[PDB]
Amino acid sequence: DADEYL
Amino acid sequence: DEYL
Amino acid sequence: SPYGPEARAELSSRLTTLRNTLAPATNDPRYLQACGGEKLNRFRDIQCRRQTAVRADLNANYIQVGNTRTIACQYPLQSQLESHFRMLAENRTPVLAVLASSSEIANQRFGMPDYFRQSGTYGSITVESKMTQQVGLGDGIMADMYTLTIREAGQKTISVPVVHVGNWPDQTAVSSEVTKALASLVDQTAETKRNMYESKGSSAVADDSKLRPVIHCRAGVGRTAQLIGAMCMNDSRNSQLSVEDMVSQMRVQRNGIMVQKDEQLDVLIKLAEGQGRPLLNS
């Protein structure tokens, strides 16, 4: 996902 | 311009 | 004495020679040159080592002191912000330490954009700033922390921890005690973030050029070098690494000005003496 590192 |  | 006036004089002698040899010449092959057009260097006397440059359009360098890996740069120019943010995101930056004072940032003549204490748009990149904790470092010196969330279409969204010391004026050096506390905070912050990336199986763990703390002040040679030196002495893997090694490595990997003021060098010497670490190489 685009924000998986958040 | 210059830092020193 | 290994920390007496004789040794200190010898150390200064060797470092002075290195600075002169590293002095930038016209179109020096050793230093990154402006790719035509916009300005690259904030100061014409503060150049970026080409072989260790992070980006062709930024004044920033990869630096390894002993086993300690970091990135040291100048305060980004307005026109360099988009590239600066992309660099921060791709590096999976575990911590960004800003040592420029609020007074410098507020001085419009200095051209130092407040890019981390407020949200904004820079080209195709959008950034969100959020305040987090505040840690006292001693002597009234405060470390204000933030989180910067960087978003760009087609790219993974990345949040970067920020440690900002806003009361450390240029051309000066905070105490060894304050510096030691700052290095500990910066390393701890990076460790927590780095661990998160490892728990998610990030591919950055396998890239020697990524997951590096990023540190800058105004020029990226005075305050920045004092902190990087303290950080390498906080690395348990650097036993026997001398002060001579530390400074020579920062200078060869960025420019001959690293550790500008004599008072800044004295802080590194004092920290070394406290550990029984050598000042010179035999």
Side-chain angles (χ1 to χ4, degrees):
Chain A
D1 184 287
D3 311 312
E4 62 160 337
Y5 290 124
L6 294 185
Chain B
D1 182 53
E2 291 181 356
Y3 176 74
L4 308 171
Chain C
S1 174
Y3 304 107
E6 299 68 45
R8 291 166 174 273
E10 181 57 30
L11 178 61
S12 179
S13 170
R14 301 180 186 186
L15 299 179
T16 292
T17 296
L18 185 56
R19 173 177 291 192
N20 293 316
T21 301
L22 298 175
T26 304
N27 194 189
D28 198 314
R30 299 175 301 172
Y31 292 106
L32 193 62
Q33 302 299 308
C35 194
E38 48 282 347
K39 181 194 295 177
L40 170 66
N41 308 315
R42 174 176 288 285
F43 304 109
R44 61 175 176 179
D45 59 326
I46 305 299
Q47 320 242 319
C48 174
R49 189 78 190 211
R50 184 167 66 74
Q51 67 185 302
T52 57
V54 180
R55 270 188 158 46
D57 65 342
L58 292 177
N59 181 301
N61 300 89
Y62 286 114
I63 298 182
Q64 187 174 316
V65 185
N67 287 276
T68 314
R69 299 171 173 69
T70 64
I71 285 176
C73 63
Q74 61 177 31
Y75 197 113
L77 296 172
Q78 177 71 303
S79 69
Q80 304 178 320
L81 290 176
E82 176 167 31
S83 180
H84 183 65
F85 282 122
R86 177 61 93 77
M87 172 198 71
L88 294 175
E90 304 185 323
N91 175 54
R92 265 40 169 169
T93 306
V95 68
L96 163 65
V98 182
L99 311 173
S101 68
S102 291
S103 293
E104 283 165 294
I105 297 168
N107 191 323
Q108 299 306 298
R109 276 182 285 101
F110 287 179
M112 295 163 72
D114 190 333
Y115 74 89
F116 60 94
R117 292 186 297 191
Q118 68 183 308
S119 301
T121 294
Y122 311 85
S124 61
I125 298 178
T126 57
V127 180
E128 183 188 308
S129 173
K130 305 176 68 64
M131 296 182 273
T132 58
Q133 59 190 303
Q134 289 181 287
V135 180
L137 306 170
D139 293 353
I141 306 296
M142 305 301 296
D144 299 310
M145 294 175 68
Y146 307 79
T147 291
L148 291 184
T149 302
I150 307 172
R151 296 177 181 283
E152 179 171 18
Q155 304 289 159
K156 283 288 180 61
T157 302
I158 298 301
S159 55
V160 182
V162 183
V163 173
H164 179 213
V165 176
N167 41 23
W168 185 351
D170 64 294
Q171 311 283 297
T172 75
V174 293
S175 67
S176 59
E177 295 72 30
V178 170
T179 304
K180 188 179 69 175
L182 176 59
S184 288
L185 174 60
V186 176
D187 288 320
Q188 177 64 67
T189 300
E191 188 69 1
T192 299
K193 188 69 171 185
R194 183 191 64 43
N195 174 69
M196 181 279 294
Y197 282 117
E198 302 209 328
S199 73
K200 289 179 179 294
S202 171
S203 62
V205 180
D207 197 319
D208 183 278
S209 70
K210 298 182 179 179
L211 287 170
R212 296 185 177 224
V214 177
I215 310 92
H216 78 72
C217 36
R218 188 176 174 199
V221 302
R223 291 165 286 182
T224 289
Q226 186 173 313
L227 175 58
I228 291 179
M231 288 170 72
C232 87
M233 290 193 258
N234 192 52
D235 195 319
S236 66
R237 305 170 295 173
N238 297 329
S239 299
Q240 297 315 311
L241 182 74
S242 69
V243 176
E244 184 181 347
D245 286 319
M246 290 176 236
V247 185
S248 59
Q249 285 168 24
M250 289 189 275
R251 293 187 172 187
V252 172
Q253 298 173 60
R254 177 149 171 72
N255 67 53
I257 313 303
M258 297 298 278
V259 181
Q260 190 227 179
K261 306 297 297 180
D262 284 308
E263 24 284 279
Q264 299 173 328
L265 180 65
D266 292 332
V267 171
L268 299 181
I269 291 170
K270 182 181 175 188
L271 287 172
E273 174 158 32
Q275 305 186 316
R277 180 186 296 282
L279 298 185
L280 301 161
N281 286 166
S282 298

